[PDB]
Write an enzyme that holds these catalytic residues in place. Sequence first.
Site, PDB file in Angstrom:
ATOM      1  N   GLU A   1       8.440  84.579 -52.378  1.00 25.38           N
ATOM      2  CA  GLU A   1       8.360  83.195 -51.929  1.00 25.38           C
ATOM      3  C   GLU A   1       7.201  82.585 -52.699  1.00 25.38           C
ATOM      4  O   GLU A   1       6.072  82.509 -52.198  1.00 25.38           O
ATOM      5  CB  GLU A   1       8.182  83.116 -50.414  1.00 25.38           C
ATOM      6  CG  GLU A   1       8.498  81.759 -49.825  1.00 25.38           C
ATOM      7  CD  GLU A   1       7.280  80.902 -49.716  1.00 25.38           C
ATOM      8  OE1 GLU A   1       6.571  81.026 -48.696  1.00 25.38           O
ATOM      9  OE2 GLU A   1       7.024  80.124 -50.658  1.00 25.38           O
TER      10      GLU A   1
ATOM     11  N   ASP B   1       7.318  78.797 -39.803  1.00 21.28           N
ATOM     12  CA  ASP B   1       8.254  77.861 -40.421  1.00 21.28           C
ATOM     13  C   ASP B   1       9.638  78.484 -40.311  1.00 21.28           C
ATOM     14  O   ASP B   1      10.025  79.320 -41.133  1.00 21.28           O
ATOM     15  CB  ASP B   1       7.874  77.585 -41.872  1.00 21.28           C
ATOM     16  CG  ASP B   1       8.726  76.483 -42.516  1.00 21.28           C
ATOM     17  OD1 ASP B   1       9.890  76.279 -42.104  1.00 21.28           O
ATOM     18  OD2 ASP B   1       8.222  75.821 -43.447  1.00 21.28           O
TER      19      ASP B   1
ATOM     20  N   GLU C   1      -0.260  76.376 -57.030  1.00 26.99           N
ATOM     21  CA  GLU C   1      -0.727  77.760 -56.923  1.00 26.99           C
ATOM     22  C   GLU C   1      -0.339  78.613 -58.129  1.00 26.99           C
ATOM     23  O   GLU C   1      -0.885  79.702 -58.289  1.00 26.99           O
ATOM     24  CB  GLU C   1      -0.255  78.467 -55.641  1.00 26.99           C
ATOM     25  CG  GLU C   1      -0.722  77.787 -54.368  1.00 26.99           C
ATOM     26  CD  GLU C   1      -0.262  78.517 -53.096  1.00 26.99           C
ATOM     27  OE1 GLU C   1      -0.087  79.757 -53.126  1.00 26.99           O
ATOM     28  OE2 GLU C   1      -0.052  77.851 -52.060  1.00 26.99           O
TER      29      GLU C   1
ATOM     30  N   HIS D   1       7.083  73.451 -43.839  1.00 26.29           N
ATOM     31  CA  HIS D   1       5.650  73.406 -44.102  1.00 26.29           C
ATOM     32  C   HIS D   1       5.338  72.930 -45.514  1.00 26.29           C
ATOM     33  O   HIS D   1       4.160  72.753 -45.845  1.00 26.29           O
ATOM     34  CB  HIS D   1       5.028  74.784 -43.866  1.00 26.29           C
ATOM     35  CG  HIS D   1       5.242  75.747 -44.994  1.00 26.29           C
ATOM     36  ND1 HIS D   1       6.380  76.516 -45.113  1.00 26.29           N
ATOM     37  CD2 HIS D   1       4.461  76.064 -46.056  1.00 26.29           C
ATOM     38  CE1 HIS D   1       6.291  77.264 -46.199  1.00 26.29           C
ATOM     39  NE2 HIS D   1       5.137  77.008 -46.790  1.00 26.29           N
TER      40      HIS D   1
END
Lengths: 343, 342, 344, 344
Positions: B123, B31, B132, B280
């Site tokens: 990130e 990406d 997540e 992405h």
Amino acid sequence: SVFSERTEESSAVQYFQFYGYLSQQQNMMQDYVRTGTYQRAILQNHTDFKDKIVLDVGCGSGILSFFAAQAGARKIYAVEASTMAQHAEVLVKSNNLTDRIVVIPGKVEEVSLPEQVDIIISEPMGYMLFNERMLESYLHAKKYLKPSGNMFPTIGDVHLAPFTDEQLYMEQFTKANFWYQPSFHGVDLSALRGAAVDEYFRQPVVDTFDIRILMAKSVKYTVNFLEAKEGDLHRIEIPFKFHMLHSGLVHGLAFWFDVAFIGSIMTVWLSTAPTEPLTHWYQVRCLFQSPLFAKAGDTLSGTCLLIANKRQSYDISIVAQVDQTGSKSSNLLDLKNPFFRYT
Amino acid sequence: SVFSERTEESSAVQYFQFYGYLSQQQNMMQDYVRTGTYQRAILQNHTDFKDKIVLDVGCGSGILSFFAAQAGARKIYAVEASTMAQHAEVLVKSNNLTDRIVVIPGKVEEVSLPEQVDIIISEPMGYMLFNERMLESYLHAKKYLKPSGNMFPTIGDVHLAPFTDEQLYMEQFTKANFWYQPSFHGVDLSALRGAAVDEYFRQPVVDTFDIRILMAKSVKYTVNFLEAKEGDLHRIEIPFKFHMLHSGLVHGLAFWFDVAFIGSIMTVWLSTAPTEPLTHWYQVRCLFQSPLFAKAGDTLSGTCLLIANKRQSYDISIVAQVDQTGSKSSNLLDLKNPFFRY
Amino acid sequence: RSVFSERTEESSAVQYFQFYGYLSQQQNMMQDYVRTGTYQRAILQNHTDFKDKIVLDVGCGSGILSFFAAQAGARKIYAVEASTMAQHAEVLVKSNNLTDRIVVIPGKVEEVSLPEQVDIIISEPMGYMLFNERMLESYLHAKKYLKPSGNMFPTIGDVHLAPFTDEQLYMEQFTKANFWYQPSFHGVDLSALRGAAVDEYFRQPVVDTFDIRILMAKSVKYTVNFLEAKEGDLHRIEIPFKFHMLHSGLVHGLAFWFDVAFIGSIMTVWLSTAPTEPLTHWYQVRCLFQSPLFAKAGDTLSGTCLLIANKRQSYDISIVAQVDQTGSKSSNLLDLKNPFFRYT
Amino acid sequence: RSVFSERTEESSAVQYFQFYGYLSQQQNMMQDYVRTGTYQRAILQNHTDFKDKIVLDVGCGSGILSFFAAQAGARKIYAVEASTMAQHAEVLVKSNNLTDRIVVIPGKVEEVSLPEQVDIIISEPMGYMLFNERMLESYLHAKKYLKPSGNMFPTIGDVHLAPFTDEQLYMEQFTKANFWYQPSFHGVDLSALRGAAVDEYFRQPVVDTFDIRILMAKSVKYTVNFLEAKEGDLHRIEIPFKFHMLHSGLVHGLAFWFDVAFIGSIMTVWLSTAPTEPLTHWYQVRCLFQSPLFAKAGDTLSGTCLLIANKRQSYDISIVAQVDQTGSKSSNLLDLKNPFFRYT
Ligand SMILES: NC(=[NH2+])NCCC[C@H]1O[C@@H](n2cnc3c(N)ncnc32)[C@H](O)[C@@H]1O
Ligand SMILES: NC(=[NH2+])NCCC[C@H]1O[C@@H](n2cnc3c(N)ncnc32)[C@H](O)[C@@H]1O
Ligand SMILES: NC(=[NH2+])NCCC[C@H]1O[C@@H](n2cnc3c(N)ncnc32)[C@H](O)[C@@H]1O
Ligand SMILES: NC(=[NH2+])NCCC[C@H]1O[C@@H](n2cnc3c(N)ncnc32)[C@H](O)[C@@H]1O
């Protein structure tokens, strides 16, 4: 229980969550080959169901039980371990079959059935037949089967054949070569190229292909579900000796399976071979680490050893050699984590 | 630990096994918007790293730690819970940075660091930003941050806007109407038709779209990572009041996010907005089981409520109404398992 | 006590004949040049069947068929019409100088009194799907005035049906009913009526044309012989069917069209409304299944189309279709009196 | 036996209530946002006229207006409906958990019996040209159940009339009728019916919309105060007009539209179908003159529009007008029951 002793808890949780979805049941049900052939095998062998006691192992939405009822079954026991058992029982109500179909939530290795049955039905086949290890639950269910009872499917055949596919083999290195650059945004990644190669080669490739890539008639390994014990599926050693029909480089082995319903009226076959219309099982290909040159007429001998693991799958050890030259290759794959390549 | 208390073990096993694959690392790294933007944020703010102590949370193969090293960092602790940490150490050795990058295997909630850090890099953004639950690990790591330390990224903005897309709606509607059949091989499935609709519409749709499908300017919800505590992410309430610019059917809400790296030299933005080049992360849409009709000038009011779950994700509740008519829509979604449509 | 009034609700008959009193409707029928030209051809090319004959024209409207019979040399033409159009027919007979040959007789053919038996009956009794308007029964009732040697123009009628696939049409009708699925229309929950809405919308046969490539099997044919049939035959019309599927896909319903033959002494002339033929004002008719049936090439789709005549001058249609291989079954009820005109 | 039956032919009523028995017709009216939005806004923004009040909903259809009354806090709502739609309305009252506040009463408002007097009557009785369908009389008849203080929603209705110029629309009548002006249509001279065809087209009011720039004079207004009017007042409606021509040109007829006002205690809300407002399912209605009238800007066009109620639930329309400065005179007789829908 038997199921828990052979299954890691984390794997079983994820497993039954997957099958609790109506979309995954739908995925199986709208495969006409799968659903049409089951229905056709049950109804065309109606004398094996009429006024009989039936066991449905892992009924899911219950579709196979309904076919058994269409065939005149006296009483059907449908065992389902996921939360789909609630939905199956809903359909049993809405189809006015509560007096014929009894949904039993739980694992077939743990639930308590009241009586012995005349025939067991189930659809437990996975990628290259054995993936998910549900054939062991299918065979485990024979403790509820009368000695003169029957199994639908009665036999399963896994087919192995060598293939050539230069594109597929080269694809692994083109992807891994992402890491073979000295300054990706200033970072030298090339030290991980080897690990990346090894990672890709451990993945069986799920997709279809043109039958023109097959280089020899398939070798067949048969499991007779009426005779087999579930212990026979813990270690499956498939010896093969391929009589090469074409000359070229062999890049690996292609896998597919067949099952057969051996009823009293007739035998019906469900096939996932690449010569047949595509199914949701597709086919599976395992690459050799290095290709082997074989001439038409040569023999490619070796073994495919499938070792069951506690992730409800298999580790695949393949060894092959061209007898006339001695050239040999191998690979070790993890069937639990396949690469879905179909497009 | 904080992590295991909020995480089902079955989810964590699957989670860290997914991030042990080099192919997934290659995917994130390719990406170019993401990797290039992170590198620019770090290098153009080299003064925030020069001779500093750095913590990289969830370093993966270590790319961000290498950027910190390129910018002049004195020491970088790179924490990684998956087996990818051993591959990160390989690259540190092969790039001759053993004196500057120190991989620390394990969960940032469990490991020990020898000293406090000047800046935290990471990130942590999933689909729709919060998927997540990595932002909680990012914020948890502030226990190692010196007073007046920096966070890279520093803030995150969630954007939500109503959209119209008949094609997408009927696409999901069609999949659920399979269970409308009263004679599928002779079997009446129609009793499960309600359950199927519920299941299919609980899936957020991950893909991109044209901006002309959006029927009102977006509403912004801002998380300031310098101030937020991980507890603030257990229950996220996003009130919204849209002023409809177009008339038509509202099929749901579209979601995207921006993060900003607020450094001493310049602010650098990483955006996943549909007006910006694709990443992405794409964008996320939550569909209504039944669309609402609105006219230009009307107000669409409601709340988006995100309840974090033990499967490292969020249960999403969207309630919305057309104020002028009282037409209301109530919807529930499971962010853990989206539908990838791109 | 008239046959007509016994089978027709007064309210239906009033609206029916008012509709046919409009000259604009006559213009529309006449401007179907396939219809008007084929009728003229069937009559003139069989002139020997009319020359010096006595003719009865059932439902003559403005009288065009009676003029065709006069051109072919009929000696006397009784033109029966129950609407006020009969007065415009009379005007045309005078202005065309045919008062000595064409005699307009206003009223219902079941109620008037013809001065003599006739050699041939001519009429245009076909509605949508052939049977709509129950005019075939008046046509057959009129045989009480026909000589033993007499002929009928048209002589026979063939109904064709074939299974079709058309996802756009199905979704078009499905969407309209989805309005009644809203749980908060201006704050009001309509969803409890969604079932009734779907039933209403799919009760409408669709009248329009279509490409022949949507048809999934060869048509089945049902034939009515007007020379032999009796009025009572058309009260309950049972059309069994067994289709050998030539393509795989979803069967969304059955498509209907019809042909009539003018079996004359010189030649047989056919008027067709099939989708392989030039378009007429009858178009074609499709009956949608609420739930399509999935079939494979080589499967058999069997069932029954059953038309029960009602007192609104039309038919209640029930279609039961079943994929024999899988036992997947579909049952549908449609109201032919009020179709969906999709062509515009 | 009842007020309704004594003024309505059975055949007309049978067809009328069958039409409104379809959910699609309810959907069509409900999806007109101007109609449905404006009624909801008029009811909710005057919530004090409804809060804990007894309400009568005349011809409730699916019941939507009753639900708006309940949203405004009404104590008891009697929802009267004569078609089979009343069964569906009851389903919605149940599914929306309002059976304690909304009582569906199947039947004609002229024939049912209510348990008590009401504080306010609500209804949507406007047809084409306001008066078509003659349901304003049922609305007024219902005031036998209204309390002396009671209110009416809508409270007043204004029909507007204005002269227009439209060469295209006028000529189009002869283009269509001239189909009959040919001497050998398949051998038949149709020309004797051309005049009858012309007359037939001019008798139809034209339902569609138009650019306001075709209006040649400010509209004249006829008002019906629903609090004061009686049923009998709508049997013969005489609308004099004296237009002061703003533009010079040929007047081809009169354009009609209407407004209604909900005069509540908090505010007044208007529902307008004027050509200057967003289009509604009522569109606008134009009645042609069979011969246009030339007028200069500043001239006066004077005359009368007489609406005579008929037993088909509509009106016979008589328009006569003359240009006072020249004496040139024209008229027309139209049948409002069978308008020509021209909108595309
Ligand atoms: N052909 C396949 N690739 N998989 C077949 C899965 C069919 C159904 O069996 C259920 N199932 C699987 N194992 C078991 C078990 N031990 N006991 C009960 N149900 C089970 C599972 O939950 C699913 O709903
Ligand atoms: N952009 C994303 N969609 N996710 C960012 C986090 C993912 C990376 O952080 C790692 N990771 C996730 N949670 C943790 C944790 N609590 N501690 C350490 N590493 C972690 C994980 O193994 C992977 O390398
Ligand atoms: N081709 C069609 N789509 N429908 C049949 C022809 C219709 C014409 O027959 C007339 N007509 C219908 N029924 C009757 C009847 N019982 N007797 C006389 N005229 C009739 C009707 O008034 C009209 O002029
Ligand atoms: N806005 C219009 N253009 N027409 C208004 C019709 C609305 C509803 O009133 C019903 N309705 C009509 N007349 C009556 C009546 N006399 N009594 C009861 N309901 C009636 C009719 O069945 C329909 O459902």
